[model samples]
Target chain A: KKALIKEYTEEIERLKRDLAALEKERDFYFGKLRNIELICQENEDPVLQRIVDILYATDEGF
Target chain B: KKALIKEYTEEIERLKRDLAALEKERDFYFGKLRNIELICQENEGENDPVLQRIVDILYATDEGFVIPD
Candidate 1:
């Protein structure tokens, strides 16, 4: 019984660690997206506009 | 002792759900970045500096520091 509780404690600790790491990764990608958006907003080039279009495009089902 | 085990079970279950959602969100943003990379690569003839900068940022794999604590 004591061993099982120890296992649970370690599992929760690992899960919390995984959560923080994934959150950081998500934010990192989001920052890239933000910079892309900012650059596109500042530029009126057709290619950049095309890039912005793809960035904003999403699945309707989502 | 049985009640204590039940509390652990509940806490672990909640933690698993949080982990699952975070993984999903990380993958979702990754997909967007992949699409952007593909678009940039497809237009290689354009040779724009700003577009190349975006490509380089996407290629980075590190956060520039470790959580040494």
Candidate 2:
């Protein structure tokens, strides 16, 4: 019983690390999009306006 | 004995779901970045300054990204 519990504890800890790593990567990518979005907003050029629309898309369907 | 095993199973299942959801979210953001990267690359041949800035941001590898003047 003690061994099983220890094994589970280790497994859970590993999962925690993995979760943290994934969260960090997710935030990294999100920040990239946000920075790019803000840059797009600065110009408001008609050429790349569609990309801005996608950046600001509120629909969760995407 | 059975109860403890069942509880652990549920906990592990919850963790799995959370991990899956995070992965999906990560991919969602990644795809958005990729889309913009491709757009910038496609228009890069024209040497548009605005698109160049956007590309620079996309290529930034860290959190200290500064918007070019």
Candidate 3:
């Protein structure tokens, strides 16, 4: 009984560690996405706009 | 052994799901940066590769650092 509980407990600990790491990773990714969106907004120059159209071009109408 | 195996199996499943979700987010961010680069490209173009800069940030976390799954 004791061994079983100890094993389960360790499993829980490892799971928690992994979950925490994933959360941190997700947070950072979210931050990176937001940063790109923020910068993309600043880029409205005609030269930049010219490229955005093509870079983001779609197949639907193209 | 049967009981412990079950426990580990369930835990592993959850970990994969979490990893997959995390990987999805990373992909989304990475995709945005790639698109941004498509629109704006140059060895030292314009004033910045703000897009390029952030793309590198993803690697800092991990190249394999993908959605938890």
- Give the candidate number with the greatest TM-score: 2
lDDT of 2 at B62: 72
What CAPRI grade goes to candidate 3? acceptable
Badly placed stretches (over 4 Å) of model 2 are A56-62, B63-69
What is the per-residue lDDT of model 3 for residues B1-69, given as tens digits with 9 covering 90 to 100?
A: 788768766876777687777777666655655565555454335555654553454344545352310
1 against 2, candidate with superior DockQ:
1
Model 2 lDDT per residue over B18-68, tens place: 999999999888887777777777777889988887777777767566544
Poorest stretch of ten by lDDT in candidate 1 chain A: A53-62
RMSD of each: 5.1, 3.8, 7.5
Model 2 C-alpha lDDT per residue in residues A1-62, reported as the tens digit of each score: 78777887788888889999999999988987887777777776665876776676665665
Name the best candidate (by DockQ).
1
Fnat for the candidates in order? 0.65, 0.58, 0.36
Clashing residue pairs in candidate 1 (N, C-alpha, C atoms within 3 angstroms): none
Score each candidate by Cα lDDT.
0.78, 0.79, 0.59
Q: Score the docking of each candidate (DockQ).
A: 0.64, 0.62, 0.25
Report residue A42 deviation for candidate 3 (angstroms): 3.0
